[PDB]
Amino acid sequence: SSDLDVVIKSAVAEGNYNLNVTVDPGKNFVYKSDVMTLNEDAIGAEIVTA
Amino acid sequence: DSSNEALAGTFVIQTARLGDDSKLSFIGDQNLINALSLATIQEGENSET
């Protein structure tokens, strides 16, 4: 596989090992920015539903 | 599965005689031999005459 790393500390034994993986997921990060407002003289347009 | 070839992408090397005569030895440069990285998975045993 291309997503497996190995680090060595002491004497290793031998052999071919087969691994089985099971997962239980968690959560992620959500960032919020602040409100933006216009200057004293600007003009804007949009399409809004009503 | 459940045989000598359970692993994908590996070389398997054998000999057609029995006993100590079937031992193999590999010699060469250090880097090439390190890259090959041979290992033993079965050992021979003597006959009974």
Question: What would you note in describing this structure?
Answer:
- This is part of a larger assembly, with 2 copies of chain A.
- Chain A has 50 residues and is mostly loops.
- In chain A, 0% of the residues lie in helices and 0% in strands.
- Chain A has no helix or strand.
- Chain A is rod-shaped.
- The chains hardly touch.
The gist of it:
The structure is cut from a larger assembly and holds two copies of chain A. Chain A is low in regular secondary structure and 50 residues long. Chain A contains no helices and no strands.
Radius of gyration of chain A: 28 Å
Strand content of chain A: under 5%
The secondary-structure class of chain A comes to: little secondary structure
Which range best describes the helical content of chain A: under 10%, 10-25%, 25-40%, 40-55%, 55-70% or over 70%?
under 10%
Number of helices of chain A: 0
Distance between the termini of chain A: 55 Å
- The number of distinct β-strands of chain A equals 0
> What kind of sheet is the major sheet of chain A?
none
Rough outline of chain A: rod-shaped
- The oligomeric state of the chains shown is part of a larger assembly
Subcellular location (chain B): Secreted; Bacterial flagellum
Protein name (chain B): Flagellin
Family (chain B): Belongs to the bacterial flagellin family.
Function (chain B): Flagellin is the subunit protein which polymerizes to form the filaments of bacterial flagella.
